[PDB]
Design a protein around this ligand. Structure first.
Ligand code: SF4
Ligand code: SF4
Ligand code: FES
Lengths: 629, 629
């Protein structure tokens, strides 16, 4: 086939089974869409927002404006803003559930506990909360405070942004009028702006997008990730097994898949109970095992070890259909994106049971719906185990032929700001030393999805990462793009020898890989803590640091909201494939050429790994020169 | 000339001036878009939500599913849900500002007061709030409670829905799982569901649309309209002037345009100050006048009299460009949709000044930006007056040639539930008796925009209304469609001559027109109070009543969210033009054929006035037969 598949042999092997079984799958479905691609939509110059449409910009035939009067620049930026309301809403949804989960845990009504009490008290102190009473009392106050940050209106000052952002950024944001309200109000204001005949000004709409990105990081992401650390521990580096060879057909295999890790943690706790292992053995299995997929899986591997029960990370979202084709999964428990909506016929062919554990996730052919509530997660996890044992006995065992690829890779996971400081001996200064000396030229935040638009699964991401480390650029990674680097072997100690002269030397001395796994796209806020620490140590603004961000195989608006944040934060932000805006020439000029004089950041483009890496290195070296290094 | 223009002569005269002046306008811009219409988008079977797209459904080349695996029905319903997030967001934005305006008024910080104190105390008692102390204390408490209704989550029981919705409906909603959270959480949940690889199930997406409609009416619309009644009075029927002949070129003319009435009320109060009338006269004007446009204008005409200062209502949103072509406007002050984004060049040519009074409203060529805050609205109004005096002197008077059409129509505005009860002698019983006897066959809620898609401006709306009243069907109207019927003369006593024999008899006896102006699309919740009262008097469910809803020239999602509410409320709901759904056969079946067995309601379609009226009458007669009347 000339069908774009994957850079990973395990996925290519399983794609062959899908094709031979004549089952629909993302790789094959790309080809028919390629025959009929709409150029207007590709360029951002179509609109479907009201009944006078649908409209298109085509100046050659006199269609210079939409019926309502909007121009191409406003049209393109408006649809970008509307889609980014979806991205912000997902992070806001997740944060709210994290805060309710901490509150209910503190009240004693979940299987969870308060694990990182030091972080709980430090956060409460930094936010000037009352710290008297028991740890549980403090956790309740923190949960209510972080809910207040979600709800804050555009007229009440926030505290998270003051604690966690650097000084010069705050001044820039106040000058521009982009200090945000809470994300719930900001996303509502953004959506209202996009209604027909409201905001048709591309500069205004772009500014609203920048505000929305700031609200997402300071108003949702930083709080949610620190709360998940309080519940489940702060990650430290440890070795993890990845890729699809981690499966063994003789066990009952439950896979959790999504972004929110609460059900997965409850499943691991329940699977460790003897009553449930005994059930699996009586059903004919060797034992019962739990596995993570995509971002929920990554959240767990950041904080938990591989053991007899929890087995590691399968892969990113384009691995889900291949995973079912192993014929080894008993339950796939899905909590959020990505849960692709044609899994039904694959689950039927390969003998797997599909369980949704969120009211958000629905599609044809799901077998069970167990919507999450903190006070019911113990019961949900036990029901899932019961379903999995019956599915193994009645659907899979003795009926489905397994075809599990042999590929397994090792990755060191669980890097956090805290783990970096520890690896440096307690201070950031040794990292500053090696950057000033030129051994490490700079650092890149790789915050990405995966997609088929600009290559086989993960092709641009992995090859770009190789080119960056060759140029002595350290990578901090999150998202489906992080899962790709783990599976490709860039996150273990052998990868030291893939780096250039200075970075390989530093990594060898510190005993760390040249790509540091920081988790998920939800950890963009956490990555900003590292960049903010560098800004303070060098006493410079973030826009002047030798850093950059890349989302090189972006798919949807969890990544683009992080890119909008990076722009507001003053950074060179590479995005591929092109977002649908290139038919809007004044918008393109704003994002790629004029933003350095506004926020300090800019959008960069392209899918050639060498050219993209060269352009990033040139920016880094420009920053270095002005710093005197 | 074959161009689609308007049913209204005044608009047609002003279109000729726009054309002579070679200025772009909605009527002329429709033609170029016609030449290149995308049939995939017309049918709802294109998607632009992620980078693997843009996708289209075309079975001939094997493009049966999007790359992600979503089918045509999920694709169409998902984009409908996302767009209705925008609609819900505008109502939620408006409600929040109304509640902050009431609270700040109670604290003494605005030019407004507590006008309908009886409504304040009755609403507080119905909601079981503390009524001790000062009226201002009660108003603060009510404002805080209604803000809580906006913010309540999916697991916290509402009170507005219990007070204002009937039990038989509440039982259906609980059985279906569509009892909503507050609108802020509901709209965030809906947006998150629309992200790629989250909710791809058309039945689930439709159900989430019904929930969203319920959250909008009970969590935003009823509260905001009753709070506006508390601030500005409860409407009673009175005579108003409408259409573009109300302008006079020798006065300073300030037009307020949008949905939120706060700036408009402040302008009327400021214009009544002798110092401001004196400024106008010293500038060469006869005096200073305020006019209302679209929904903000309608809110004011519902509650305020015509006098020497406030002159009435210009018309609906397709009248805005023609209105500027009169060469009589000094300031257009814009607070929300509809503010079409190419007004700039028209304002320049005709010598009018554009002022935005909301952070939502931005587009090229606006002259001043005065974002609303309750504590600043007194200063905003004064600044607008000073701007208008300068503009009259320097831009318009004696320099721009006015061309004001002669047309003025009379309309009886300000119908409310309270006004209907008063006209009936204090109870709904007389209306029940004339429905039972067959003098009035049934009643229609016409809750509508205007558009060019399915005819010249207001052609379908006005002619459908005429066909309905001829069939002895009473109309309650709101929205741009209400402005259309007012301008067409269907809302005065002369219009009784066009009603059928039974309705004309009732109208003459009660001294009311056959079309009752209930205000805006934001008054859908208020209209439900009348429908709930009819169902209670007859001891039946709302789905059993001889009523229907029509949005016969819908444009955007302020109207569609009201249609989704009407479906959830069990009603036959006619919508034209077709929403972009007709390429999705199972979604079409759900909405048009299966919903009667689910909620009781159904979507009806079509743009022929006679056929649409006959289909509505047939539904009414089916309901009557089942009731035995
Ligand atoms: S919002 Fe404007 S450009 Fe978009 S469909 Fe409506 S008339 Fe066309
Ligand atoms: S969400 Fe699915 S159908 Fe829509 S553009 Fe992405 S791959 Fe195509
Ligand atoms: S698919 Fe309709 S304009 Fe692109």
């Amino acid at each position: 086939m000339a069908t774009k598949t994957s850079i990973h042999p395990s996925v290519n092997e399983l794609y062959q089974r899908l094709a031979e079984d004549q089952l629909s799958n993302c790789f094959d479905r790309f080809d028919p869409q390629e025959k009929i691609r709409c150029n207007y939509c590709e360029l951002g110059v179509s609109c479907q927002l009201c009944s006078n449409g649908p409209c298109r910009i085509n100046e050659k035939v006199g269609a210079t404006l939409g019926v309502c009067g909007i121009n191409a620049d406003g049209m393109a930026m408006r649809y970008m803003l509307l889609r980014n309301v979806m991205g912000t809403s997902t992070y806001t949804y997740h944060a709210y559930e994290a805060y309710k989960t901490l509150k209910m845990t503190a009240l004693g009504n979940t299987p969870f506990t308060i694990t990182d009490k030091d972080k709980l008290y430090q956060m409460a102190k930094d936010l000037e909360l009352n710290t008297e009473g028991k740890p549980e009392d403090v956790a309740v106050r923190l949960s209510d405070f972080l809910i207040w940050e979600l709800y804050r209106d555009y007229d009440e000052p926030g505290k998270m942004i003051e604690v966690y952002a650097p000084l010069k950024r705050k001044e820039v944001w106040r000058k521009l009028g982009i200090y945000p309200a809470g994300p719930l109000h900001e996303l509502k204001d953004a959506a209202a702006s996009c209604l027909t005949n409201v905001d048709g000004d591309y500069v205004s709409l772009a500014t609203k997008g920048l505000r929305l990105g700031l609200s997402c990081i300071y108003g949702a992401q930083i709080g949610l990730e620190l709360v998940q650390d309080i519940l489940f521990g702060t990650g430290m580096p440890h070795e993890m097994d990845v890729d699809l060879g981690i499966f063994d057909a003789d066990y009952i295999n439950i896979v959790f898949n999504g972004h929110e890790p609460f059900v997965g943690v409850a499943l691991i706790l329940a699977a460790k109970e003897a009553v449930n292992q005994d059930k699996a053995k009586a059903a004919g299995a060797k034992s019962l095992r739990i596995y993570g997929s995509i971002e929920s899986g990554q959240e767990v591997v950041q904080r938990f070890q591989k053991d007899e029960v929890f087995r590691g990370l399968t892969g990113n979202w384009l691995t889900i259909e291949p995973m079912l084709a192993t014929g080894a999964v008993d339950v796939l428990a899905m909590d959020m994106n990505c849960s692709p909506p044609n899994l039904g016929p694959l689950a039927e062919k390969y003998g797997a049971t599909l369980v949704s554990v969120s009211r958000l996730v629905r599609f044809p052919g799901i077998h069970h719906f167990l919507d999450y509530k903190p006070s019911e997660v113990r019961e949900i996890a036990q029901k899932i185990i019961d379903i999995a044992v019956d599915s193994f006995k009645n659907k899979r065992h003795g009926k489905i032929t397994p075809k599990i690829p042999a590929n397994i890779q090792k990755a060191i996971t669980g890097f956090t700001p805290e783990a970096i400081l520890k690896a440096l001996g307690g201070s950031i200064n040794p990292l500053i030393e090696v950057i000033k000396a030129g051994k490490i030229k700079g650092a890149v935040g790789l915050i990405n999805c995966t997609t088929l638009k600009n290559g086989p699964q993960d092709y641009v991401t992995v090859n770009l990462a190789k080119e960056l480390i060759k140029r002595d650029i350290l990578i901090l990674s999150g998202g489906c793009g992080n899962h790709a680097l783990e599976v490709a072997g860039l996150c273990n100690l052998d990868a030291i020898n893939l780096a250039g002269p200075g970075l390989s030397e530093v990594c060898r001395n510190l005993n760390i890989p040249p790509v540091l796994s920081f988790g998920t796209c939800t950890d963009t806020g956490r990555i900003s803590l590292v960049v903010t620490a560098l800004a303070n140590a060098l006493n410079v603004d973030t826009a002047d640091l030798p850093v950059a961000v890349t989302a090189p195989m972006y798919m949807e608006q969890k990544a683009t909201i992080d890119a909008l944040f990076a722009l507001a934060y003053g950074l060179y932000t590479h995005v591929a494939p092109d977002p649908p805006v290139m038919g809007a020439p004044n918008l393109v000029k704003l994002l790629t050429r004029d933003l350095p004089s506004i926020t300090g950041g800019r959008i960069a483009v392209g899918s050639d790994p060498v050219k993209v890496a060269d352009d990033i290195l040139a920016h880094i070296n420009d920053r270095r020169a002005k710093l005197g290094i």
